[PDB]
Amino acid sequence: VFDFKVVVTNPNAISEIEDNKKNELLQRLQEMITDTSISEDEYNIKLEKLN
Amino acid sequence: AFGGWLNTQGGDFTNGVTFINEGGSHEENPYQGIQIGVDGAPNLVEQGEVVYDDYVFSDRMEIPDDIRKEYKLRGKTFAKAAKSAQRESEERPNDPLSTKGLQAAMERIATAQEEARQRKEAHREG
Amino acid sequence: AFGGWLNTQGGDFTNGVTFINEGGSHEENPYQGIQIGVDGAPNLVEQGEVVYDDYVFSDRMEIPDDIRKEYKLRGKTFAKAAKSAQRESEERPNDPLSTKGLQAAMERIATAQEEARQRKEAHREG
Amino acid sequence: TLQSSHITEWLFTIHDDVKKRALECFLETAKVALKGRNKKFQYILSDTSTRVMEIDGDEFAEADYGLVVDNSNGTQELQQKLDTLAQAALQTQTLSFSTITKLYTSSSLAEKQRLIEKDEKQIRERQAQAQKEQLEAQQQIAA
Amino acid sequence: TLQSSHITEWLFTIHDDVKKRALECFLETAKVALKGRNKKFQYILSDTSTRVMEIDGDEFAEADYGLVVDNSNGTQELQQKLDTLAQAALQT
Amino acid sequence: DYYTYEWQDIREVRANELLNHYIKEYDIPLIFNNGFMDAMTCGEEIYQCD
Amino acid sequence: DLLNGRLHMSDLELVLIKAAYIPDRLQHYPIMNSKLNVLRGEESKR
Ligand SMILES: [Mg+2]
Ligand SMILES: [Mg+2]
């Protein structure tokens, strides 16, 4: 067999420095789809993808 | 940074005494001190004093000989008395017995400084 | 194109500093200097100035010797002094320590350029 | 190959204690690296697990705190029992699918015991209020 | 012939740790190529995966963040569990 | 969710999260295999943790 | 050294050589290795 998948070693262990980095990245995506969507035409389309 | 810490085997281990060096006095510093935090918001410490669990041992005071025979102090100053009660526990930060010995040694010089604080304000007022 | 970049091994790795050359001065350019982009929408830069994190280090200014002794600069110009503090960080654009040492060293010359700017506008006002 | 595999079973049995005692001694080594300003440990641990060092005596062997490193048949029969119970709670609409994957990805038999007792408690108050809601709705139409 | 495959199992156990460490080293080389202005990594990565590079932790190893390359019997049991969980949840 | 946990369960999750990562990181099973060969040669199977 | 294919001739007799030739030295035949590789190969599969 060959399934050398990258796994999380402790998947039930979420911390605060993990949550501040997810909160920073999710605020980074909102600056993108505000700029790349043209006046609410696809703004509710991309928001359903990152929901 | 060698002040009250043990940086060995790739980590930064401490015993709780925060040596506050290298800054300067409250008059010689443009920021009036080191400003370790904001709580009392302007918490200013100088080049000689040390902190153990948000209590500061001042380097400006001296040791009265009444408060040296009792409480068994070692340094010439209250700051130098807390720098001599952590000399065992600086090299062994993860011991159970040395941490119990450090918590009790700092709780003597806490009361030894507060008695010298209460003595000085009473003589200055009267 | 060599300006603050490390174009090795088929990829274009940068440390953030934007060496803006080859254009010309503001009067020697028909378009009034190279345009980084649109924000004031005319963001104009010239052949001497460098940019780190959307802050332009001016090449027309000079270094006061009192602004040289503190903050410990090297160049004759503020933009020339950013070209010597990033000299370490050009050859290691993905080193984690060097991206900390660049963001600290570009911060000093930015505030040193600000203190040169508030000094210059006040003296011409008086 | 069952009566020949017993001749070398003296060798694995002494070996399966050194694996036990080097993993008990590795754990006490990792407990001191926590209090050493290492930022790796805030990624591999949870929010409660980072704070067990604030509560005192983290300098005392975990066998004095009720915990042993154990590879026995008592651990393995407890491990299979808590999983086949979890599929038996998966059907009969007792255990969610969001919490079955928390049981599958826990590596601890205390974490996966507290997960079963929580979601059984979570739906039992939901079935209590929904039986309470349908009874009180019956009286107010009757009233 | 199972009891002969035990004899050469010393040879396959040092092999898979070499393959595990080569893919931890390959993941780290692939990470540094991300911040090197390469338009190929936009196609094989998603919307959110390119923005992980913009966060200030990426220059270190993924084994320091809780993520290891792993082909043990821990993940092959777990991959088989999540597939029978998917088919049992597809029905009902 | 942390009210229904007990202190011996909070300690067991902290200990297992350390061991589950560091067995998977260092490949601690292969450290135990190369010591078993020194067990069947010397009689001495010695490990250092620091 | 027996597992790595080195026979020491001072260990299986008195010596009355040092050079690598079977007219005066002895060839080692690795027959102990296969029985040890069962057992370190079975510890990998438990
Ligand atoms: Mg985690
Ligand atoms: Mg694609």
Mutation choice for F interface testing from D14, D20, D26 by most F CBs within 10 A: D26
CA nearest G2: which of F30, F42, F32, F35?
A: F42
* Cα distance between residue B110 and residue B124, in whole Å: 21
User: Which residues of B fall within a CB distance of 8 Å from D32?
Assistant: 94
Chain D closest-CA separation from residue A47 CA (Å):
24
Q: Strand B17-19 relative to strand C50-52: parallel, antiparallel, unpaired?
A: unpaired
F37–G44: do the CB atoms touch at under 8 Å?
A: no
The distance of F21 to chain A (nearest Cα, Å) reads 5
For residues D129 and E67, give the distance between their C-alpha atoms in angstroms, rounded to a whole number. 42
CB-nearest to D40 from E64, E81, E82 is E64
Q: Tell me, what amino acid is at A9?
A: T
Give the closest residue to E67 by CA, choosing from C96, F13, A5, A24. A5
D119: nearest Cα among D85, D71, D81: D85
- Cβ-contact E28, E58 below 8 angstroms: no
| Residue to substitute from D99, D111, D115, interface F, most F β-carbons within 10 A | D111
d(Cα D121, Cα F36) in Å, to the nearest integer?
47
Burial class (CB in 10 A: 0-12, 13-18, 19+), B79: buried
Structure tokens at C49: 């100035």
In this complex, is the C-beta atom of F41 within 8 Å of any C-beta atom belonging to chain G?
yes
Q: Is C123 exposed, middle or buried (0-12, 13-18, 19+ CB in 10 A)?
A: exposed
User: Phi-psi category of G15—alpha, beta or left, where left has phi over 0 and alpha has psi -120 to 50?
Assistant: beta
- Cα of E48 vs centre of ligand 2, distance in Å, is 12
Q: Is D39 exposed, middle or buried (0-12, 13-18, 19+ CB in 10 A)?
A: exposed
D38 closest CA partner among E56, A17, F25: A17
Within 10 Å of residue B17's Cβ, how many Cβ atoms? 23
D11·G46 Cβ contact <8 A: no
DSSP string, F1-50: --SS--HHHHHHHHHHHHHHHHHHHHTHHHHHHHHHHHHTTTS-------
Instruction: Return the CA Rg of chain D.
Output: 23
Cα radius of gyration (chain C):
15
CB neighbour class for G19 (10 Å; exposed up to 12, middle 13-18, buried from 19): exposed
Residue D25 three-state SS: helix
D48 touches chain F (CB under 8 A): yes
Among residues 24-43 of chain A, which lie with CB inside 8 Å of chain D? none
Phi, psi for C44 (deg, rounded to 5) = -105, 135
The nearest CA of chain E is from the CA of C6 a distance in Å of 9
Distances (CA, A) of B3 to B33, B86, B101, B109: 18, 11, 19, 19
Please give the Cα distance from D32 to B11 (Å, whole number).
10
Name the one residue in this structure whose structure tokens are 């939901």.
D126
Most D CBs within 10 Å, among G43, G44, G45, to test the D interface: G43
The CB-based long-range contact list for E45-54 (8 Å cut-off, 24+ gap) reads E47/A29, E47/A49, E47/A50, E48/A25, E48/A29, E48/A50, E51/A25, E51/A28, E51/A29, E52/A25, E54/A25, E54/A28
What is the DSSP track for E45-84? S-HHHHHTTTSTTTTS-GGGTTEEEE-SHHHHHHHHHHHH
Chain G contact for F13 (CB, 8 A cutoff): no
Chain E CB contacts of A6 below 8 Å: 27, 62, 67-70
Which 3 state secondary structure label does DSSP give D62? helix
- Name the pairing type of β-strands B13-14 and A5-8: unpaired
* Long-range contacts of residues D51-59, Cβ cutoff 8 Å, at least 24 apart: D52/F10, D52/F11, D52/F14, D57/B96, D58/D31, D58/D34, D59/B94, D59/B95, D59/B96, D59/B99, D59/D31, D59/D32
Q: Which two tokens stand for residue E79?
A: 């991959």
- Give the closest ligand to the alpha carbon of residue E42: 2
Q: Side chain identity at C55, as an amino acid letter?
A: Y
E34 is written with which tokens?
A: 């991300």
> According to the entry, how was the structure determined?
cryo-EM
In contact, D24 and F19? CB cutoff 8 Å? no
Q: Length of chain D in residues, anyone?
A: 143
CB contact under 8 A, E78 and D1: no
